[PDB]
CSV table of C-alpha atoms and ligand atoms in Angstrom, one decimal:
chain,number,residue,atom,x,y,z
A,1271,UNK,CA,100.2,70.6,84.0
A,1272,UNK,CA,103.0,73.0,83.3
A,1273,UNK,CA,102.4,76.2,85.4
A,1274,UNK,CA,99.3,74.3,87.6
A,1275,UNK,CA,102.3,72.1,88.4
A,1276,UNK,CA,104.6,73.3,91.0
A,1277,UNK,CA,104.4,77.1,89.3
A,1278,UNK,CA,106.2,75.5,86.3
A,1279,UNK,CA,109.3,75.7,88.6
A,1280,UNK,CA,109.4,79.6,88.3
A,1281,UNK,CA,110.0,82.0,91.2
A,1282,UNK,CA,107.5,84.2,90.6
A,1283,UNK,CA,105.1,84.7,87.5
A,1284,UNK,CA,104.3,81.5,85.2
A,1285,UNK,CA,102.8,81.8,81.6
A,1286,UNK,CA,102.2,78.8,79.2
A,1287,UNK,CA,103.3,79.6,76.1
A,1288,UNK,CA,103.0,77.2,72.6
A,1289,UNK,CA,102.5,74.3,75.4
A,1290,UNK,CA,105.7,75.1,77.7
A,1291,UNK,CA,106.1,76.9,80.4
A,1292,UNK,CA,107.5,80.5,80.5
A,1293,UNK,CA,108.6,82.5,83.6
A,1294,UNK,CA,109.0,86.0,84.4
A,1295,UNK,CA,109.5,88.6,87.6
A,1296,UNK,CA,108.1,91.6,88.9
A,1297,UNK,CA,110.1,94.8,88.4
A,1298,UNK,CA,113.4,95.2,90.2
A,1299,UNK,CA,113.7,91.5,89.5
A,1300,UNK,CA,116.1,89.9,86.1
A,1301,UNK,CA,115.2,86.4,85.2
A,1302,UNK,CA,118.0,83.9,85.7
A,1303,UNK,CA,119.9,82.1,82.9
A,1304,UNK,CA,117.8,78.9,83.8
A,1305,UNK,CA,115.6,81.1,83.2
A,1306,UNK,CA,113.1,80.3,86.2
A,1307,UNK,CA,114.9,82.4,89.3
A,1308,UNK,CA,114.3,86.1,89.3
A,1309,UNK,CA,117.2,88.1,90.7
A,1310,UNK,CA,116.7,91.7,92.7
A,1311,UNK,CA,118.9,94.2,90.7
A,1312,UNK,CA,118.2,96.3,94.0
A,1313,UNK,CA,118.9,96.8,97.7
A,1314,UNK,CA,115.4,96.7,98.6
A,1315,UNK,CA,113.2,94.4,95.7
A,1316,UNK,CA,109.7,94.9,96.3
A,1317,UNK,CA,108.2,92.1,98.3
A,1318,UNK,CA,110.7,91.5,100.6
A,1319,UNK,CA,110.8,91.8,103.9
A,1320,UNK,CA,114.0,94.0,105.4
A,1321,UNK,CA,116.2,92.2,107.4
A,1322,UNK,CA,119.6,93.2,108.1
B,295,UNK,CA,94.0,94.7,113.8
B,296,UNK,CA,92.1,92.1,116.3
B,297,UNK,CA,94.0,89.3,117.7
B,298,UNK,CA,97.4,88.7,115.2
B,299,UNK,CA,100.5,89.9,115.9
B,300,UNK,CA,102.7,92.6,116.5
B,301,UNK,CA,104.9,93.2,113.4
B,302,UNK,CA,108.5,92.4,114.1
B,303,UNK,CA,111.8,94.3,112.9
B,304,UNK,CA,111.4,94.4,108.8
B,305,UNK,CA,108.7,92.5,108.7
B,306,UNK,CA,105.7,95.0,107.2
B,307,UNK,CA,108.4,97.5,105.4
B,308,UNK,CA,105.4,98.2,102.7
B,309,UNK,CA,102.9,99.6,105.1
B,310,UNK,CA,102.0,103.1,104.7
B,311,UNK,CA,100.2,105.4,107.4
B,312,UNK,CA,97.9,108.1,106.4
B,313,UNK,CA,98.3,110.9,109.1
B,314,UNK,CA,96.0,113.9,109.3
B,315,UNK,CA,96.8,117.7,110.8
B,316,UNK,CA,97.4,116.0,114.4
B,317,UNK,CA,99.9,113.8,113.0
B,318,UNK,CA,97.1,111.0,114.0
B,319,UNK,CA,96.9,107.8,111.8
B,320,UNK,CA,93.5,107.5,110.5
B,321,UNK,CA,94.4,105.1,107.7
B,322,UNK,CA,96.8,102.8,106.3
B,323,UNK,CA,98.6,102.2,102.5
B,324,UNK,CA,101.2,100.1,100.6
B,325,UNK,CA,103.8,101.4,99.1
B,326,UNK,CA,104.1,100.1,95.1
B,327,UNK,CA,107.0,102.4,94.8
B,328,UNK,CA,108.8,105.0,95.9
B,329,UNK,CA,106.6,107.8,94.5
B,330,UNK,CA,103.2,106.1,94.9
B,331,UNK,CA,100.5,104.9,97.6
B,332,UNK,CA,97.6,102.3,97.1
B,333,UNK,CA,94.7,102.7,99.8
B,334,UNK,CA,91.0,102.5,100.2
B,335,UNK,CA,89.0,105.6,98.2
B,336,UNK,CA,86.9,105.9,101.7
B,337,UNK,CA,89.9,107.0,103.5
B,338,UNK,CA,90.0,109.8,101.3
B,339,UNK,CA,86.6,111.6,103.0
B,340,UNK,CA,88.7,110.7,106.7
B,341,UNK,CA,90.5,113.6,106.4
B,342,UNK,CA,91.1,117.0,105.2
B,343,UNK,CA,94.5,117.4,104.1
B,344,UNK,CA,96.7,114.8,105.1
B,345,UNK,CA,100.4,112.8,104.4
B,346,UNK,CA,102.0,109.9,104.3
B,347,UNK,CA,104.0,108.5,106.9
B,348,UNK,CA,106.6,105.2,106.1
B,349,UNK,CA,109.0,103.3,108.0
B,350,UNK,CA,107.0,103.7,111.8
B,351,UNK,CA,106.1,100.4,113.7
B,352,UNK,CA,105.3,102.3,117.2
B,353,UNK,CA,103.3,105.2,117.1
B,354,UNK,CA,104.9,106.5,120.0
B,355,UNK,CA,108.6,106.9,119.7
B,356,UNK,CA,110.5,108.8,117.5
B,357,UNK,CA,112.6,105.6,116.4
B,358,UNK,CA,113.9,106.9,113.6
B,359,UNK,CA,113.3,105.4,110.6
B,360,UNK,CA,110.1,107.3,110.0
B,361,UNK,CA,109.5,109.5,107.4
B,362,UNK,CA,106.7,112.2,106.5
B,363,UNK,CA,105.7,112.0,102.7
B,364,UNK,CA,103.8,114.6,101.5
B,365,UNK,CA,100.6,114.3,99.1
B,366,UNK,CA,101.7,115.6,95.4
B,367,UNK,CA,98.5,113.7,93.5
B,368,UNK,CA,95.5,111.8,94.5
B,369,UNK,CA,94.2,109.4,92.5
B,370,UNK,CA,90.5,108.3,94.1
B,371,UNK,CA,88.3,105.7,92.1
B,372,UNK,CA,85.8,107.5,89.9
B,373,UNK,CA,83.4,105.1,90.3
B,374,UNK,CA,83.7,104.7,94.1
B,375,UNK,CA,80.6,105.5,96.1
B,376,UNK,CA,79.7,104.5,100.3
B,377,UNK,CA,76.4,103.7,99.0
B,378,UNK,CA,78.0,100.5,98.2
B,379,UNK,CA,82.1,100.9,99.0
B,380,UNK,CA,82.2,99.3,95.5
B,381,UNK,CA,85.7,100.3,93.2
B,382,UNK,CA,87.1,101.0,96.7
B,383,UNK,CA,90.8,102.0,95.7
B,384,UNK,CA,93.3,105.0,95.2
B,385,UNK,CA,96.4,105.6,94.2
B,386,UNK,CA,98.7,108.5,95.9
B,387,UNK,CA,101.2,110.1,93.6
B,388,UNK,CA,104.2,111.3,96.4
B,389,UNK,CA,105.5,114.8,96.1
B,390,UNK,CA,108.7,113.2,97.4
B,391,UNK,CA,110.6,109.8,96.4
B,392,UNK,CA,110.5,106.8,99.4
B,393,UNK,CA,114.1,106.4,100.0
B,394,UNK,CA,113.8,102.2,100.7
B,395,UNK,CA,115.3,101.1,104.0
B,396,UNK,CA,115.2,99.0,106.8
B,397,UNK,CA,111.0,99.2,107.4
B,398,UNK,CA,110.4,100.5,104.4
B,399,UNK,CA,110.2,98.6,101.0
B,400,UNK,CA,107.9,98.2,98.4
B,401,UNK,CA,105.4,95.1,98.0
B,402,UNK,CA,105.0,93.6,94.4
B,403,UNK,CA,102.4,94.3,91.9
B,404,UNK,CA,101.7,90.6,90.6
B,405,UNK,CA,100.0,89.6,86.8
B,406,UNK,CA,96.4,89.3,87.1
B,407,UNK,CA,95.8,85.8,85.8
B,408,UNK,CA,99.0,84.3,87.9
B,409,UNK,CA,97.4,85.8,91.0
B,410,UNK,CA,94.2,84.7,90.6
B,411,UNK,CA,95.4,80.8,90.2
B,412,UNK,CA,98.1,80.5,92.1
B,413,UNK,CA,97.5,83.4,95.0
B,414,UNK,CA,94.3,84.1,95.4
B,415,UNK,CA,94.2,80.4,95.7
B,416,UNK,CA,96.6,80.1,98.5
B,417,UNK,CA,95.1,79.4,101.9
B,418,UNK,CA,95.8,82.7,103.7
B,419,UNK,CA,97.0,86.1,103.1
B,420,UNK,CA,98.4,88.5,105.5
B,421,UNK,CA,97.1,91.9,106.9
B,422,UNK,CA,98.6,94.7,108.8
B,423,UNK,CA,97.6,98.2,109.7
B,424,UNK,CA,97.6,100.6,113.5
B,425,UNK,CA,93.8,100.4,113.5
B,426,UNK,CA,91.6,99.2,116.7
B,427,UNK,CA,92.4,96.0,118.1
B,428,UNK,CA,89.4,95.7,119.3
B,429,UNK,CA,86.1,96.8,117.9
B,430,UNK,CA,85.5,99.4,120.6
B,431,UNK,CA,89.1,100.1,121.2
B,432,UNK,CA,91.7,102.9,120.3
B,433,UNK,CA,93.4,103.3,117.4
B,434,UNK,CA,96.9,101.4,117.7
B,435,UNK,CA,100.3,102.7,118.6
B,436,UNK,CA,102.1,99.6,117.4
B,437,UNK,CA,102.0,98.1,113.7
B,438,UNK,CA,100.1,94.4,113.9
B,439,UNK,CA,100.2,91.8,111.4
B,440,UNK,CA,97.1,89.1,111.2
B,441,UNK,CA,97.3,85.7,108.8
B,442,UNK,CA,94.1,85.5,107.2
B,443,UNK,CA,92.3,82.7,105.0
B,444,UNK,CA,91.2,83.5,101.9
B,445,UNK,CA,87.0,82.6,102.3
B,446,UNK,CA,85.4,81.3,99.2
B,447,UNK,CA,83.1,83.3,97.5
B,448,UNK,CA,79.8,82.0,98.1
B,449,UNK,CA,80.5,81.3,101.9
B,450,UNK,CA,81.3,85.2,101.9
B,451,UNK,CA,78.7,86.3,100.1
B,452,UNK,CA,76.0,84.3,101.9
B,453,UNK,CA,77.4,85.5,105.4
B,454,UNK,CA,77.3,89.3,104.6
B,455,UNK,CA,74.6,91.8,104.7
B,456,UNK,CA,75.8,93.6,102.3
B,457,UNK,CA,76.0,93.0,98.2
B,458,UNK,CA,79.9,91.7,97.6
B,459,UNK,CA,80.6,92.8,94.2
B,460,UNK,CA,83.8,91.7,91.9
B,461,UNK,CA,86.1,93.8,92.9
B,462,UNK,CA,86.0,92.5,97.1
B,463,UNK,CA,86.8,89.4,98.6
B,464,UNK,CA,86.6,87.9,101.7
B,465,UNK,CA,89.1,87.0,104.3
B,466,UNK,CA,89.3,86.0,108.1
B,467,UNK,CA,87.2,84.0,110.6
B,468,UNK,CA,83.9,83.3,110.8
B,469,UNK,CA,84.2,82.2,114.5
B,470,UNK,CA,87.7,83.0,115.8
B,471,UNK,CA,88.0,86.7,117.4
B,472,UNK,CA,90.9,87.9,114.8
B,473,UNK,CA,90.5,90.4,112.2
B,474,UNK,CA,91.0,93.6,110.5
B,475,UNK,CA,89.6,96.5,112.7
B,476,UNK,CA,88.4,100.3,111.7
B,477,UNK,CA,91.8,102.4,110.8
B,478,UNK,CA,93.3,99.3,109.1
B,479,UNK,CA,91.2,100.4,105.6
B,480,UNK,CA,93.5,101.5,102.7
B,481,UNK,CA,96.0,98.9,104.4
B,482,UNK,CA,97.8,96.3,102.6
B,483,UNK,CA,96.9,92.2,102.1
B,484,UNK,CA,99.6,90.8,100.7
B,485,UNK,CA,100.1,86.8,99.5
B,486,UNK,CA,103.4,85.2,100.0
B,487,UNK,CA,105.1,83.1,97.5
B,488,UNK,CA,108.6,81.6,97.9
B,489,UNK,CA,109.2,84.4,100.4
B,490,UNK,CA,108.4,87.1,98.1
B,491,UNK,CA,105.5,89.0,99.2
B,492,UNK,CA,102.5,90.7,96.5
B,493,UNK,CA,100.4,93.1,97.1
B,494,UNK,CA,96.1,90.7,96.6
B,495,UNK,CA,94.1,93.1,98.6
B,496,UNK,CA,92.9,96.9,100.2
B,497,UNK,CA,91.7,96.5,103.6
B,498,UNK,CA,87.6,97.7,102.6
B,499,UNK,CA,84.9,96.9,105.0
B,500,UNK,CA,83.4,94.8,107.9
B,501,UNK,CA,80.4,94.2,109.8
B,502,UNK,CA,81.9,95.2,112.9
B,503,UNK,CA,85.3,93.4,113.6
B,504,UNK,CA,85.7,89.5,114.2
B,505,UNK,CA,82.6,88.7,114.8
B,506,UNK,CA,80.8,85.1,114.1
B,507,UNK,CA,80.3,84.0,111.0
B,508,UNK,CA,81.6,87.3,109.6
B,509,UNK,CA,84.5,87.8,107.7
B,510,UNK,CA,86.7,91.1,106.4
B,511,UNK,CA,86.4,92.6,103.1
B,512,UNK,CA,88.8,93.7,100.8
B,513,UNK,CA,89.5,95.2,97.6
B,514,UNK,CA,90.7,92.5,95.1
B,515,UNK,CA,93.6,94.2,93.3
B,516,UNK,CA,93.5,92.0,90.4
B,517,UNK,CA,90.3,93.8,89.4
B,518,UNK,CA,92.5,96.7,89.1
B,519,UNK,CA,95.6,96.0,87.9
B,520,UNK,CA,95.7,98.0,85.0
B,521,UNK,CA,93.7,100.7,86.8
B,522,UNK,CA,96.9,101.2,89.3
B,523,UNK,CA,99.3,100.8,86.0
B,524,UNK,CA,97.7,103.7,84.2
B,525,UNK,CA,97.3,105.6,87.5
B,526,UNK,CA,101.2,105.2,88.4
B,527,UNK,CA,102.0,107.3,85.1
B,528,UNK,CA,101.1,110.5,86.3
C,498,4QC,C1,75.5,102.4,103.6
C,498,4QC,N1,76.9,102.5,103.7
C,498,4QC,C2,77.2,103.7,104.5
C,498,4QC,C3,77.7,101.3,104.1
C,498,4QC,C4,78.1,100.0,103.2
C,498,4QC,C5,77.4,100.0,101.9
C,498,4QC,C6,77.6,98.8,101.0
C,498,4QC,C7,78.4,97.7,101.5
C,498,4QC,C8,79.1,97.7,102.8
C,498,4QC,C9,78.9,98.9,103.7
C,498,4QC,C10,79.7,98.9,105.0
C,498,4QC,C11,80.8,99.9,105.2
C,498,4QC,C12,81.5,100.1,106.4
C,498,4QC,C13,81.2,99.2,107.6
C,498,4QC,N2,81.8,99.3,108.8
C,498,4QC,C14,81.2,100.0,110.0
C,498,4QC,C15,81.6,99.3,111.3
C,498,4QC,C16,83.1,99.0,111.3
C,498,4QC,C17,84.0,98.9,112.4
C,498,4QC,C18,83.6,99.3,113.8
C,498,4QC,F1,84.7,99.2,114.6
C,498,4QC,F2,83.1,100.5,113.9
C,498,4QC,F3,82.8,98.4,114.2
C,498,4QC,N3,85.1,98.5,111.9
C,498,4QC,N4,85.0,98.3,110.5
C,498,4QC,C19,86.0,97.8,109.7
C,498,4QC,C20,87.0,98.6,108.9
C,498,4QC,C21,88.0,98.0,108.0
C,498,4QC,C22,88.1,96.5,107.9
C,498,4QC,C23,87.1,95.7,108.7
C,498,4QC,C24,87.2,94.3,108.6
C,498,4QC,N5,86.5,93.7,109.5
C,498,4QC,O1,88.1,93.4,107.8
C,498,4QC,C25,86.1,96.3,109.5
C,498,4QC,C26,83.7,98.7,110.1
C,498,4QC,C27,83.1,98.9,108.9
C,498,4QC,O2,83.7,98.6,107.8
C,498,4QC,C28,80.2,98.1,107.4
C,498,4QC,C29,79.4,98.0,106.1
């Protein structure tokens, strides 16, 4: 099922590619080393909500 | 909004108010960035010259947080007409970079295939704006928030009078009295996923507001993805 399971496991975008799953983010956000998280290079990543 | 609730602290920091010469909301937006605005394309014949206000939650006090953007480029739909509020979209180019803060943050722009499968898919989506709370009510002074289900296609397009193209969907209640109101337009729908919220919808059009076996409809922003990409190089 890859990405129509569980997102593939990714935080944010999913992408099969040659039969695997691939992850990636939205700008502002760095993929992680497992290469599924996406990390906010930012104070203020789009799409979350501000709560300080 | 109708019904829903009142946004909370942080909550909506990507909403966007389009204010005319009294300083009156008349619209909503969502900030993509800190130079740009996406709203509805019919919110651009509301109002002569107008600007962009980010950060307010109570149209009342002078909390703070607010700040006036001014208009530096808009970018209306060329193929948008109100003969059938199809292509319903518009992009603002800023004069004047958002600074991001507490209230104010941008929402994300999401792939178009990965948001059509996994949230467009999704059960509900959420909707905010200062429009009427009810359908014969005043504009609102407070920011509301409303969950609303996604409603499939053909239930949608069966229920409405009008012809629902490709680019709108359909969201609310067919009985329940919640849903988007006049002055929300141009506002943002946004799907959560994992807690990060992305921009699915424009707040479009309604046969009145919460009525029976009616629903809201919005702009679907996948349609227009690369629309919004090519218009946020100017
Ligand atoms: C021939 N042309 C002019 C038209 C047309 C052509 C083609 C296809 C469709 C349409 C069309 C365009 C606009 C409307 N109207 C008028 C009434 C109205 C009201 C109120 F309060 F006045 F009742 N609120 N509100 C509203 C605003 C934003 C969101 C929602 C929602 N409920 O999510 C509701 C509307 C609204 O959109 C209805 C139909």
């Amino acid at each position: 099922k890859l990405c129509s399971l569980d997102n593939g496991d990714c935080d944010q975008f999913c992408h099969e590619e040659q039969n695997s799953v691939v992850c990636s983010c939205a700008r502002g956000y760095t993929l992680a080393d497992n290469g599924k998280a996406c990390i906010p290079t930012g104070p203020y990543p789009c799409g979350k909500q501000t709560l300080e | 909004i109708v019904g829903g609730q009142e946004c909370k602290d942080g909550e909506c920091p990507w909403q966007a108010l389009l204010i005319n010469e009294e300083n009156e909301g008349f619209c909503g937006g969502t900030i993509l960035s800190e130079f740009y605005i996406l709203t509805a394309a019919h919110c651009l014949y509301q109002a002569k010259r107008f600007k962009v206000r980010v950060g307010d939650r109570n149209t009342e006090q002078e909390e703070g947080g607010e700040a006036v953007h001014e208009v530096e480029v808009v970018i209306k739909h060329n193929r948008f007409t109100k003969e059938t509020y199809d292509f319903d979209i518009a992009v603002l180019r800023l004069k004047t970079p958002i600074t991001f803060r507490m209230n104010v943050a941008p929402a994300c722009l999401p792939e178009r295939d990965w948001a059509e499968s996994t949230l467009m898919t999704q059960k509900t989506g959420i909707v905010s704006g200062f429009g009427r709370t009810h359908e014969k009510g005043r504009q609102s002074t407070r920011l509301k928030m409303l969950e609303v289900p996604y409603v499939d296609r053909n239930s949608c397009k069966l229920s409405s009078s009008f012809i629902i193209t490709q680019n709108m969907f359909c969201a609310g209640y067919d009985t329940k009295q919640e849903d988007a109101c006049q002055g929300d337009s141009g506002g943002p729908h946004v799907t959560r996923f994992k807690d990060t919220y992305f921009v699915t919808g424009i707040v479009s059009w309604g046969e009145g507001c919460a009525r029976k076996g009616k629903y809201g409809i919005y702009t679907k922003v996948t349609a227009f993805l690369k629309w919004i990409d090519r218009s946020m190089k100017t």
